[PDB]
């Protein structure tokens, strides 16, 4: 085999000399047998004099010059298919759940080309999420990129678990969740939550595969964990023909890790410190996430904004790729409306009559107008009092609060602690229900009959049971 000695070790950067004069290609993976486990190096440059420069996927403490490296003959390659479901994988595709080997038939290289222009899908399509406020007011793009916004405590993890559950139930497609520079505490809490919710099931069938890269990992690993997760999702698309979900726990951490890798290589920093390759790095990650003839990978990505500066180059570069945005915000949860999606700040490029159809677009537009008018008056109606307005405006306020409560939904993942049985609401049923509410057909029913309920037939049944009460 092609094998070479270590010749320099400078933090996470290692130089390797291949006296065989058959150098590993750029992005090839090389491996060293450390006393514990193994250390993987990814090739980053060819320096000349048979010497390559490489970035380390693990800590380099204890390396010696003259240490022996094997060229693995390709990029980092990770196990794929069903065996990944319900298991936690690191950047190099080792199991870190301690449940033993993954023993898949296949490994796939994490570096691969996007689908060609002829391969691209020529028209947009809606991924029905089963979530009323999403499926109506910010429909998710099948094969698209979706940004997820908000602080802590807004319910992101329960929303993500319900997306995993709903897409597994309604579409049969699996999910992959990749945590990029995540807190190891929060990755542990996520794994525990996912076992309690049962989207991971150690004895049974698991609906999600987990990939994690930790803040304590070197920047090369944190930079590549997104590509490992993407490569598993791509395998489910390409060879199971599924509609897959790919969750990225923070895409800013991916940008930051790429910036650290670039700085360690010694490239001149750019717009505000980010690597000069910032846009091409993002483009190489993102536009592999697409629909093809066999299926789609749809990606939900958590967009941290470094100083609330939406104009910062990492947000501005990410926003170019997003097909939709979902904002979770504290205020909507303070009204007690879960999933706490902001119905007005969430937006979709696909909410256009050609993609959705005119009926959906009309219903969603009328809902948005009703909520925006209610929010605009809501201060002055509190100043003047509720009677101090036109009876038509007071009627639109009654509609607005009834619709706003109607946007709450019981999640089946929530059921383990909320107790109320979760419900998955189809897109057509959502459009019909909100059209009927906007037509005023249920103006008589009290607004609390609309809270945490699975559609207008369920609104009627809840009103009947609560009136019998």
């Amino acid at each position: 085999p092609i094998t070479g000695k270590v010749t320099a070790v400078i933090g996470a950067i290692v130089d390797v000399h291949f006296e065989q004069s058959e150098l590993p290609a750029i992005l090839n993976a090389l491996e060293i047998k450390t006393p514990q486990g193994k250390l993987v190096l990814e090739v980053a440059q060819h320096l000349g004099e048979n010497t390559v420069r490489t970035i380390a996927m693990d800590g380099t403490e204890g390396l010696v010059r003259g240490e022996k490296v094997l060229d693995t003959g390709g990029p980092i390659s990770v196990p794929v298919g069903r065996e990944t479901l319900g298991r936690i994988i690191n950047v190099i595709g080792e199991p870190i759940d301690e449940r033993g080997p993954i023993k898949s038939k296949l490994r796939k290289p994490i570096h691969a080309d996007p689908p060609s222009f002829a391969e691209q899908s020529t028209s947009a399509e809606i991924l029905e999420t089963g979530i009323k406020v999403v499926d109506l007011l910010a429909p998710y793009a099948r094969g698209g990129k979706i940004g997820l916004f908000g602080g802590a405590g807004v319910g992101k993890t329960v929303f993500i678990q319900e997306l995993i559950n709903n897409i597994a139930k309604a579409h049969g497609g699996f999910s992959v969740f990749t945590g990029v520079g995540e807190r190891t505490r929060e990755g542990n809490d996520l794994y525990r939550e996912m076992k309690e919710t049962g989207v991971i099931n150690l004895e049974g069938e698991s609906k999600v595969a987990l990939v994690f890269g930790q803040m304590n990992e070197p920047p090369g690993a944190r930079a590549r964990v997104a590509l490992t997760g993407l490569t598993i999702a791509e395998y489910f698309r390409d060879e199971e023909g599924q509609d897959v979900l790919l969750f990225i726990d923070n895409i800013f951490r991916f940008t930051q890790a790429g910036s650290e890798v670039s700085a360690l290589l010694g490239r001149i920093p750019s717009a505000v410190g980010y690597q000069p390759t910032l846009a091409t790095d993002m483009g190489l990650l993102q536009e592999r996430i697409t629909t093809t003839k066999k299926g789609s990978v749809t990606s939900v990505q958590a967009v941290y904004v470094p100083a609330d500066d939406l104009t910062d180059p990492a947000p501005a570069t990410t926003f170019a790729h997003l097909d939709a945005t979902t904002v979770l915000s504290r205020g909507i949860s303070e009204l007690g409306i879960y999933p706490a999606v902001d119905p007005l700040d969430s937006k979709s490029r696909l909410l256009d009559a050609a993609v959705v159809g005119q009926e959906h677009y009309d219903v969603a537009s009328k809902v948005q107008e009703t909520l925006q008018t209610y929010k605009s008056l809501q201060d002055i109606i509190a100043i003047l009092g509720m009677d101090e307005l036109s009876e038509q405006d007071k009627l639109t306020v009654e509609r607005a609060r009834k619709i706003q409560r109607f946007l709450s939904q019981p999640f089946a993942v929530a059921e383990v602690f909320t107790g109320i049985p979760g419900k998955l609401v189809r897109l057509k049923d959502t459009v019909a229900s909100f059209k009927a509410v906007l037509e005023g057909k249920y103006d008589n029913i009290p607004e609390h009959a609309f809270y945490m309920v699975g559609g207008i037939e369920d609104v009627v049944a809840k009103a009947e049971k609560l009136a019998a009460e």
């Binding site: 505000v272 410190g273 100083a307 104009t311």
Partner: protein
């Protein structure tokens, strides 16, 4: 402008906008009192109308002032972000040119 100058200016305009919104609320409570006096007096009727008018004009002016301050806070937030970015990149270019 240096980043601290625009940060201090922005902080001051946010303070003024809160101050004027509170003065608006206080003017609205005084306007309720003035409306009570105006109706009860309906020279005393002159001062009761003039007081209710002054309190209403102050409420309106403080509403306008708060809206103007909100727009200026938006403008200064944008200029603050642009100054922050420009400072970061200029200092990093100076560090790189020193390292060369």
């Amino acid at each position: 402008a240096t980043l601290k100058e625009v940060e201090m200016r922005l902080k001051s305009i946010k303070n003024i906008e809160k101050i004027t919104k509170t003065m608006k609320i206080v003017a609205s409570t005084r306007l309720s009192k003035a409306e009570k006096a105006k109706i009860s007096a309906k020279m005393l009727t002159a001062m009761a109308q003039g007081y209710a008018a002054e309190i209403s004009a102050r409420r309106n002016a403080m509403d306008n002032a708060s809206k103007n301050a909100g727009d200026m806070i938006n403008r200064y937030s944008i200029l603050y972000n642009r100054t922050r970015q420009a400072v970061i990149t200029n200092e990093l270019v100076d560090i790189i040119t020193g390292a060369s």
